[PDB]
Design a binder for this molecule. Sequence first.
Ligand SMILES: *[C@@H]1O[C@H](CO)[C@@H](O)[C@H](O)[C@H]1NC(C)=O
Lengths: 48, 24
Amino acid sequence: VKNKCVNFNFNGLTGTGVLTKSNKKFLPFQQFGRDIVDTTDAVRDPQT
Amino acid sequence: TTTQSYTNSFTRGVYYPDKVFRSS
Ligand SMILES: *[C@@H]1O[C@H](CO)[C@@H](O)[C@H](O)[C@H]1NC(C)=O
């Protein structure tokens, strides 16, 4: 469920937040996302 | 056979250390 504050457990990466569609350019070998200060920002759906 | 001449690698041979996306 998107655009709704939910607890997520993507591939053992526990946390909480609001997730939605994005226009990142994840390379085929990429799995996670991060920012300048090293906080997980984007994740790739294991079944999608 | 083979030779063992020496050259300079320039700026070459950098891979992605991890699998984490980063921009700017
Ligand atoms: C996950 O598995 C199901 C059944 O095997 C398949 O229909 C679906 O396409 C798969 N999803 C991905 C992203 O591979």
